[PDB]
Design an enzyme around this catalytic site. Structure first.
Site, PDB file in Angstrom:
ATOM      1  N   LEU A  44       0.710  -1.283   0.093  1.00 57.64           N
ATOM      2  CA  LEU A  44       0.031   0.126   0.010  1.00 57.64           C
ATOM      3  C   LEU A  44       1.056   1.417   0.026  1.00 57.64           C
ATOM      4  O   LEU A  44       0.588   2.267  -0.624  1.00 57.64           O
ATOM      5  CB  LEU A  44      -0.924   0.003   1.366  1.00 57.64           C
ATOM      6  CG  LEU A  44      -2.322  -0.571   1.058  1.00 57.64           C
ATOM      7  CD1 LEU A  44      -3.149  -0.492   2.389  1.00 57.64           C
ATOM      8  CD2 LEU A  44      -3.176   0.494   0.374  1.00 57.64           C
ATOM      9  N   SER A  45       1.898   1.428   0.864  1.00 61.70           N
ATOM     10  CA  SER A  45       2.645   2.504   1.130  1.00 61.70           C
ATOM     11  C   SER A  45       3.888   2.104   2.028  1.00 61.70           C
ATOM     12  O   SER A  45       3.834   1.227   2.406  1.00 61.70           O
ATOM     13  CB  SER A  45       1.833   3.915   1.386  1.00 61.70           C
ATOM     14  OG  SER A  45       1.464   3.476   2.808  1.00 61.70           O
ATOM     15  N   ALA A  84       9.089   5.974   6.733  1.00 61.58           N
ATOM     16  CA  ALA A  84       9.879   5.706   7.806  1.00 61.58           C
ATOM     17  C   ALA A  84       8.978   4.976   8.821  1.00 61.58           C
ATOM     18  O   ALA A  84       9.476   4.082   9.762  1.00 61.58           O
ATOM     19  CB  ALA A  84      10.255   7.323   8.365  1.00 61.58           C
ATOM     20  N   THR A 105       6.382  -0.061   6.331  1.00 60.56           N
ATOM     21  CA  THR A 105       5.762  -0.484   5.224  1.00 60.56           C
ATOM     22  C   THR A 105       4.081  -0.851   5.739  1.00 60.56           C
ATOM     23  O   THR A 105       3.944  -1.532   6.632  1.00 60.56           O
ATOM     24  CB  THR A 105       6.196  -1.681   4.444  1.00 60.56           C
ATOM     25  OG1 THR A 105       6.301  -2.640   5.551  1.00 60.56           O
ATOM     26  CG2 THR A 105       7.634  -1.206   3.923  1.00 60.56           C
ATOM     27  N   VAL A 106       3.405  -0.272   4.897  1.00 67.09           N
ATOM     28  CA  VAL A 106       1.735  -0.602   5.119  1.00 67.09           C
ATOM     29  C   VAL A 106       1.171  -1.726   3.959  1.00 67.09           C
ATOM     30  O   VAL A 106       1.496  -1.272   2.792  1.00 67.09           O
ATOM     31  CB  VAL A 106       0.988   0.608   5.197  1.00 67.09           C
ATOM     32  CG1 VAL A 106      -0.502   0.396   5.278  1.00 67.09           C
ATOM     33  CG2 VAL A 106       1.396   1.562   6.237  1.00 67.09           C
ATOM     34  N   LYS A 163       0.854  -2.330   9.489  1.00 70.87           N
ATOM     35  CA  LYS A 163       2.240  -1.673   9.418  1.00 70.87           C
ATOM     36  C   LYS A 163       3.156  -2.741   9.984  1.00 70.87           C
ATOM     37  O   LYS A 163       3.122  -2.965  10.960  1.00 70.87           O
ATOM     38  CB  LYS A 163       2.104  -0.291  10.201  1.00 70.87           C
ATOM     39  CG  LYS A 163       3.221   0.278  10.276  1.00 70.87           C
ATOM     40  CD  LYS A 163       3.518   1.800  10.336  1.00 70.87           C
ATOM     41  CE  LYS A 163       2.754   2.171  11.608  1.00 70.87           C
ATOM     42  NZ  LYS A 163       2.975   3.445  12.006  1.00 70.87           N
ATOM     43  N   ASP A 177       3.259  13.723  15.762  1.00 68.85           N
ATOM     44  CA  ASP A 177       3.761  13.705  14.430  1.00 68.85           C
ATOM     45  C   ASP A 177       2.328  13.791  13.371  1.00 68.85           C
ATOM     46  O   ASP A 177       2.437  13.135  12.328  1.00 68.85           O
ATOM     47  CB  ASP A 177       4.428  11.993  13.941  1.00 68.85           C
ATOM     48  CG  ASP A 177       5.272  11.981  12.762  1.00 68.85           C
ATOM     49  OD1 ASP A 177       5.512  13.221  12.305  1.00 68.85           O
ATOM     50  OD2 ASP A 177       5.329  11.044  12.487  1.00 68.85           O
TER      51      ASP A 177
HETATM   52  O1  LIG Z   1       0.623   6.916  -0.384  1.00 68.63           O
HETATM   53  C1  LIG Z   1      -0.013   6.784  -1.238  1.00 68.63           C
HETATM   54  N1  LIG Z   1      -1.529   5.974  -0.845  1.00 68.63           N
HETATM   55  C2  LIG Z   1      -1.979   5.745   0.074  1.00 68.63           C
HETATM   56  C3  LIG Z   1      -3.263   5.283   0.122  1.00 68.63           C
HETATM   57  C4  LIG Z   1      -3.904   4.314   1.295  1.00 68.63           C
HETATM   58  C5  LIG Z   1      -2.948   4.052   2.491  1.00 68.63           C
HETATM   59  C6  LIG Z   1      -3.700   3.453   3.880  1.00 68.63           C
HETATM   60  C7  LIG Z   1      -3.017   3.265   4.847  1.00 68.63           C
HETATM   61  C8  LIG Z   1      -3.699   2.730   5.847  1.00 68.63           C
HETATM   62  C9  LIG Z   1      -3.378   2.416   7.163  1.00 68.63           C
HETATM   63  N2  LIG Z   1      -1.768   2.585   7.544  1.00 68.63           N
HETATM   64  C10 LIG Z   1      -1.465   2.163   8.857  1.00 68.63           C
HETATM   65  C11 LIG Z   1      -1.211   3.397  10.103  1.00 68.63           C
HETATM   66  C12 LIG Z   1      -0.850   2.895  11.187  1.00 68.63           C
HETATM   67  N3  LIG Z   1      -0.743   3.749  12.310  1.00 68.63           N
HETATM   68  C13 LIG Z   1      -0.269   3.135  13.531  1.00 68.63           C
HETATM   69  S1  LIG Z   1      -0.662   1.099  13.317  1.00 68.63           S
HETATM   70  C14 LIG Z   1      -0.970   1.390  11.688  1.00 68.63           C
HETATM   71  C15 LIG Z   1      -1.387   0.364  10.680  1.00 68.63           C
HETATM   72  C16 LIG Z   1      -1.610   0.943   9.376  1.00 68.63           C
HETATM   73  F1  LIG Z   1      -2.131   0.080   8.458  1.00 68.63           F
HETATM   74  N4  LIG Z   1      -4.054   1.888   8.058  1.00 68.63           N
HETATM   75  C17 LIG Z   1      -5.611   1.692   7.564  1.00 68.63           C
HETATM   76  N5  LIG Z   1      -5.736   1.806   6.417  1.00 68.63           N
HETATM   77  C18 LIG Z   1      -5.119   2.416   5.537  1.00 68.63           C
HETATM   78  S2  LIG Z   1      -5.258   2.788   3.902  1.00 68.63           S
HETATM   79  C19 LIG Z   1      -1.583   4.695   2.678  1.00 68.63           C
HETATM   80  C20 LIG Z   1      -0.952   4.849   1.081  1.00 68.63           C
HETATM   81  C21 LIG Z   1       0.452   6.683  -2.691  1.00 68.63           C
HETATM   82  C22 LIG Z   1       1.143   8.134  -2.856  1.00 68.63           C
HETATM   83  C23 LIG Z   1       1.788   6.705  -2.975  1.00 68.63           C
END
Ligand SMILES: O=C(N[C@H]1CC=C(c2cc3c(Nc4cc5ncsc5cc4F)ncnc3s2)CC1)C1CC1
Ligand SMILES: O=C(N[C@H]1CC=C(c2cc3c(Nc4cc5ncsc5cc4F)ncnc3s2)CC1)C1CC1
Lengths: 287, 278
Positions: B17-18, B21, B24-25, B40, B132
């Site tokens: 997904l992304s 730092a 990785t998600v 993550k 942050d």
């Molecule tokens: O960047 C781009 N597109 C984005 C489109 C969708 C994205 C999403 C991320 C997350 C997410 N992150 C997450 C944070 C977290 N914090 C503490 S524990 C934890 C566990 C997690 F998984 N959590 C749930 N749903 C989503 S949807 C990011 C990339 C393109 C430009 C290159």
């Protein structure tokens, strides 16, 4: 660890509902500045039961379970604080027909899907949690009509009767913690959702209902009850009949129900769910 | 009470997904729960992940990213959260070909919900400080409600663009929020004209901030004067002049009361449809 919320931080307390489960009133949290709801009941055994439910919600948190925000436990007040659900319960959505003349199928099927995901989650916990009081009154609807299952007063770690399987009419440890109670409630809820009818509406006496259910009778399955335009009608009838089967062994797990529901829910385009909510709000606002 | 432990083998259809730092998600489907999840994932490293997971477990609230469990195995460490289908606030603001007009009621609701979220953290006993906040860390659920994410450097009481100058603190989050607010109303990159992040730090150290003029914040922005006042107080050089999140909510509440619920949903449908068409 569950937060403790001083009673005085709950402002503008106002009553919503009273039921056997307990009394529910709305409030606004003085510091968080959000609407909250609170279920409240002197006693000593009663306070233990309230604390019992609060611990269970704290532990069972999940996307389709009513989120507990804290317990107000003071000598002046005992009560469970939860997020406020702005669209009430599934029961008013189904049966207040002047207020909601049209509930589009995509929304109804999403509600059914989300109920099953919630109960499936409870059943997959270590150890499995059994709700044992599923009913449309206990399915709440958030601001965009997503499901939150409520009222864990009768849950257990592994007209008020219409959701109860017959083998639980006279409860024994042969079913006291049966894993097949909830699916039967869900089958009746599913019939109720697809029909917008009161189950056993034609029976004036609830003891007559229990006698009939004990003999294998169930809410009617025909075109008047379940109209021809129900999407995937025959599949939904199958799901209902197997969920309320007389023989508890013969009822499926919620996992298996989810496995069958998933391809059905995928036949609806995603925007269609939002379309359905918008139609609910627009017509209601015009009234 | 106890946070679930999620065996790695139960995470089906893992997909990238992304990367950042924070880590990785990846997106996934939980085999037994039948929901989409995000994860993550990566000895000192193991301690930090557990710290973040514990903090999310404790900071649960309606605008905080809901944690579902920890993956803690020899082959895989990672935090499992609900899946946010609409990405981050950063994409919504800056992907201007895909999202040409982002309704004002929705932007104000997003600002309100970030403030409700951080307000909750600051009221937690003991207070939690996020430290942050950035538009990349404001996630958006199926109906574009806010979930604040990324607690890797939160503390119990371009990556620099949200950092108050004294940090090169109890007033950090409000400074980040002020920049977020400017970003939300302008749909502009703060310090857009700047090639090097050290140029930002130098100018911010001098008291300079993202430009406030007709080009950045046009005269037709609803509640222009109220928001500008909130932004300028929030990023004040002197941390003592920055308001609490309570005061931000006091400023936002009467603004949000002017909007009908149907207008939010229409704006949400317009955004959902635009993503699908791209
Ligand atoms: O960047 C781009 N597109 C984005 C489109 C969708 C994205 C999403 C991320 C997350 C997410 N992150 C997450 C944070 C977290 N914090 C503490 S524990 C934890 C566990 C997690 F998984 N959590 C749930 N749903 C989503 S949807 C990011 C990339 C393109 C430009 C290159
Ligand atoms: O019958 C009617 N209206 C209903 C309209 C609104 C109702 C609501 C109830 C609840 C609720 N109950 C709740 C359950 C619970 N379970 C465990 S702890 C706990 C704490 C709680 F507060 N929780 C959150 N939001 C709401 S909204 C019921 C009455 C007439 C107007 C048509």
């Amino acid at each position: 660890a569950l937060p403790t919320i001083p009673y005085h931080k709950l402002a503008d307390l106002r009553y919503l509902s009273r039921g056997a489960s307990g009394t529910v009133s709305s409030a606004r949290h003085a510091d968080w500045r959000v609407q909250v709801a609170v279920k409240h009941l002197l006693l000593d055994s009663e306070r233990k039961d309230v604390l019992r439910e609060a611990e269970i919600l704290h532990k069972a948190r999940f996307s389709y379970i009513l989120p507990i925000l804290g317990i107000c436990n003071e000598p002046e007040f005992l009560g469970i604080v939860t997020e406020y659900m702005p669209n009430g319960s599934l029961n008013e959505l189904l049966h207040r027909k002047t207020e909601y003349p049209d509930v589009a199928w995509p929304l109804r099927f999403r509600i059914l899907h989300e109920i099953a995901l919630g109960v499936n989650y409870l059943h997959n916990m270590t150890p499995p949690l059994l709700h044992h009081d599923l009913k449309t009154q206990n399915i709440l609807l958030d601001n965009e009509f997503h499901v939150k299952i409520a009222d864990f007063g009768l849950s257990k770690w592994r007209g008020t009767i219409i959701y109860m399987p017959p083998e639980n009419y006279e409860p024994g440890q042969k079913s006291r913690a049966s894993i097949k109670h909830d699916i039967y409630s869900y089958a009746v809820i599913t019939w109720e959702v697809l029909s917008r009818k009161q189950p056993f509406e034609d029976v004036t006496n609830p003891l007559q209902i229990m006698y009939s259910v004990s003999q294998g009778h169930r809410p009617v399955i025909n075109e008047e009850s379940l109209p021809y335009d129900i999407p995937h009608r025959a599949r939904m009838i199958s799901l209902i009949e197997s969920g309320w089967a007389q023989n508890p062994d013969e009822r499926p797990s919620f996992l298996k129900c989810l496995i069958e529901l998933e391809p059905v829910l995928r036949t609806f385009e995603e925007i269609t769910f939002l379309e359905a909510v918008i139609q609910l709000k627009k017509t209601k606002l015009q009234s």
